């Protein structure tokens, strides 16, 4: 797979409609994504690009149209992939890229790990880790929030969800980064197929051991609240290792789904607060805004820019005809900035009344399974921030990640001022 090398993105008004290529993974880093999507929403809301490095595709960029595509599982398929391109020549079936009814069967089998009753049992540990992390950070001198907080809290969460050995939690993050980030799939920075195969093999050995280990301990160990515990308590799933593709798939999806999304929500809120510092004063006055703010963070950031589908038949949309078999990209990042839905869509407004109606988790049968865990982690982060810090300043332009899919930060230099 060829690497994507950064070059300067031209002003969108300099281009013919036919030439707008929103698969470029530097649109986010260079700040051009907003104007590019505005033009599409306004002049070509259902747009066909016949020429791209990932092959041809439709872009759907308005909020209401994206809702329709996402909810229309009768017209659009999630199979075989939901990223714009393709993973390497043969690398792990996951229910995010499956249609009902098989989709439903697989998702039902793992969804209890994020049931409300279950999340209630994790809350104390999340809060204690969050507090410990924030207590460890330097004050009045800049540090990189991305490894210090966002990645650190996330890797700990991911290990808790499996019962993954805590001292090896980094491997979950690294394995997930390499998959999420294949150049061939998302225009991401990872171009070595061999390292992916090694990760795939190593992750399958690691999961297979942890399963056999936990079976051995469950003898007389009480089950915890992790996914593997729960799967080996439900009679339908207790044999899951005897179906290798479903076993590796469901576990991998859980880890990949919550890895960069939560990390980038955790980083993105500081970026939005730094761009609209009045909001942080508003928050300090009205701390009961935290739950609505979490929604507004998630909007505003939109951690995953899109999900892709294939048209099961010809479909009329936005004054066009999507043909059977065409790839179709639902641009959440565009829909969350659609002024037809959200007034002043680029402003971060903690008390925005319809923040909860964001599409960052999508809608329909694939709507994010981990949505409540993400919201719980983020509320707790901000509760714990608000107890400790009078200000939280970003001191350098953030470095943003190369990807058409992930909307994230690799460097975020922050200076904290304690309250007393
Ligand atoms: C802010 C954080 C998150 C964002 C923005 C996010 C976003 C998404 C999106 C856009 C989808 C597919 C939606 C669609 O196709 O309509 C999805 C699915 C999924 N997410 Fe998340 N997610 C986040 C956090 C999490 C976490 C923490 C986990 C796991 C603990 C997770 C697990 C999943 C899974 C398993 C699915 C597949 C659901 C299915 O296909 O039925 N997500 N997520």
UniProtKB/TrEMBL annotation:
<feature type="binding site">
    <location>
        <position position="366"/>
    </location>
    <ligand>
        <name>heme b</name>
    </ligand>
</feature>
<keyword id="KW-0408">Iron</keyword>
<keyword id="KW-0479">Metal-binding</keyword>
<feature type="binding site">
    <location>
        <position position="368"/>
    </location>
    <ligand>
        <name>heme b</name>
    </ligand>
</feature>
<dbReference type="GO" id="GO:0004497">
    <property type="term" value="F:monooxygenase activity"/>
</dbReference>
<dbReference type="InterPro" id="IPR017972">
    <property type="entry name" value="Cyt_P450_CS"/>
</dbReference>
<dbReference type="InterPro" id="IPR001128">
    <property type="entry name" value="Cyt_P450"/>
</dbReference>
<feature type="binding site">
    <location>
        <position position="107"/>
    </location>
    <ligand>
        <name>heme b</name>
    </ligand>
</feature>
<feature type="binding site">
    <location>
        <position position="309"/>
    </location>
    <ligand>
        <name>heme b</name>
    </ligand>
</feature>
<keyword id="KW-0560">Oxidoreductase</keyword>
<keyword id="KW-0349">Heme</keyword>
<dbReference type="GO" id="GO:0016705">
    <property type="term" value="F:oxidoreductase activity, acting on paired donors, with incorporation or reduction of molecular oxygen"/>
</dbReference>
<dbReference type="InterPro" id="IPR036396">
    <property type="entry name" value="Cyt_P450_sf"/>
</dbReference>
<feature type="binding site">
    <location>
        <position position="332"/>
    </location>
    <ligand>
        <name>heme b</name>
    </ligand>
</feature>
<dbReference type="GO" id="GO:0005506">
    <property type="term" value="F:iron ion binding"/>
</dbReference>
<dbReference type="Pfam" id="PF00067">
    <property type="entry name" value="p450"/>
</dbReference>
<feature type="binding site">
    <location>
        <position position="103"/>
    </location>
    <ligand>
        <name>heme b</name>
    </ligand>
</feature>
<comment type="similarity">
    <text>Belongs to the cytochrome P450 family.</text>
</comment>
<dbReference type="InterPro" id="IPR002397">
    <property type="entry name" value="Cyt_P450_B"/>
</dbReference>
<protein>
    <submittedName>
        <fullName>Cytochrome P450</fullName>
    </submittedName>
</protein>
<keyword id="KW-0503">Monooxygenase</keyword>
<dbReference type="GO" id="GO:0020037">
    <property type="term" value="F:heme binding"/>
</dbReference>
